[PDB]
Amino acid sequence: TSSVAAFTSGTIGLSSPTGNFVSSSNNPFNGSYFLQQINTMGMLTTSLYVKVDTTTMGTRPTGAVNENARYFTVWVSSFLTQCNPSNIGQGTLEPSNISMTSFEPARNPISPPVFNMNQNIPYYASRFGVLESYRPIFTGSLNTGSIDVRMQVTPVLATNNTTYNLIAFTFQCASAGLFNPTVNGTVAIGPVVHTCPAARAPVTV
Amino acid sequence: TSSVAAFTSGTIGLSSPTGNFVSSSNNPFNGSYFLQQINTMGMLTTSLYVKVDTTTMGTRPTGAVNENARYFTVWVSSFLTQCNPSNIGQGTLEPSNISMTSFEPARNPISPPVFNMNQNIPYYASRFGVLESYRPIFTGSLNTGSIDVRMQVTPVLATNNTTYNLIAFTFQCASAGLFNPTVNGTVAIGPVVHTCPAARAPVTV
Amino acid sequence: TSSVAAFTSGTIGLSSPTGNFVSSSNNPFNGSYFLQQINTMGMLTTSLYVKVDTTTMGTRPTGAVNENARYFTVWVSSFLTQCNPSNIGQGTLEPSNISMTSFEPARNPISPPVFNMNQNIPYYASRFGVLESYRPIFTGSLNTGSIDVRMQVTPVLATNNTTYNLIAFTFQCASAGLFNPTVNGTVAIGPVVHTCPAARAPVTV
After folding, report:
1. Would the CA dihedral through C108, C109, C113, C117 be positive or negative?
2. Residues of C whose CB is below 8 A from B192
3. At a CB cut-off of 8 Å and minimum separation 6, what does C64 contact?
4. Structural domains in chain B?
5. Which parts of the chain span the membrane according to its record (chains A, B, C)?
């Protein structure tokens, strides 16, 4: 068995808004993504692109509190059926017989707050970990400014009363606009690269 | 065959100014570098050191526009003959029969503006991607302050009119001086480390 | 022999305060750490967690001259018996016959100031290289605010008069409190990830 493994999911051209992301005001929406991870001997490197198109993201409730939200969270999961809040799709594994457990991040020993999926507050704010600064690309009148991303391996309490370790990425826009229904266009960000310890070196199924 | 490969170019001495770098005022200059790259199963990691010695970098013209310039760009290329704006030198491949195409970055899906080499405008500002913060080391009276580095995989229209994907690094100084002919010394920065998706896993020639 | 190798030291529990760290007021103290490193074909990646508990860190002398320190340094070393200022413990190598010399960082060609362990000032400030921003987790009255980490490969003159290359991590707290003996609690930070070139590709003993 290889001491190196890769997982890829999403659309190479950020074309299919199958991701379920949530704004800091608890409004879900849809975005495209491209996720490319490698496990090198127990260290997980995750490369993530995200794109949100106002014409394919869904309904933006009016109201100051809803339109003025600047943050949104994307969950990267290796438990694509048991615990997958953002709906990361099945992808491509290399070697093809490698277990998805090869992309589970190690338990985070700083012990951040649990994301409790049983209380149906769908927004979790990633807060404890590295903050990286990005400038995204726009089209239309949408202008988020620069976006910092907080990255935090987090225990997620599923409805089955068990905790699973996922990576929360919270995108922190400098300016309001993505969630204001009068503002239109697209914002695309990445590659957002995160490194953390994996639960294990790569294992075959 | 190997799922991991390495490319090394430049000199550890940082005293061979063969790099063709360009200030935001469109003034070319000579600088030293040391580039060490690894491809791990389709993920490209780049370590770059840059060093500029005012006595070897070439004539610095006077005038506010030239002397007050704080930004400069270095292009990292895997197409050393066909599209190599900053003159990355032939280097060492491990294993020795691995193809340079193993160090090609994957097309950036956020689609940033193309660098058109045919326009005879040598400076391109890296804008879209991660910004990392460095403190460099100086000698002499030269003092750039801290330097942030923006890192962007970019399509480049080469002089043969094929489009190639390269990595733009724009170094953003806090203080002017590097391009002031009355300010002398050296500045050395690094290791500046970038991760992005490669176009492929490693392949032999 | 593998072109990939791993080293792990410390405890995931972050409750064994055997690390010897030093504040900016030259006061030593004890902390817990969990260090996981990988060498991929000559590229060294370091994941580091640090935790400090006021009940186990040791005596914090009184007086603003001591209590107002916001910075501390942690030395990551591969020379565990000859040059190991923070007392990184023997750990676990994968594969088990791989040399510790596989985790030695390459000499830093920007040539930052040497740390001479034979003289009597224990605090060394990491200055030259990347600065990364983290938010840590607290318990108790302790609040350091956010913490930036400066990461610098550094020549260290050991007490045997040989110079070794090590990695200096200086943790820069936004607020004082950690070294004020009337403030109690814990602070845990990470994963702090650093990449730099290794002195060599992995080699077996």
Report:
1. positive
2. 130
3. none
4. 1-205 (2.60.90.30)
5. none
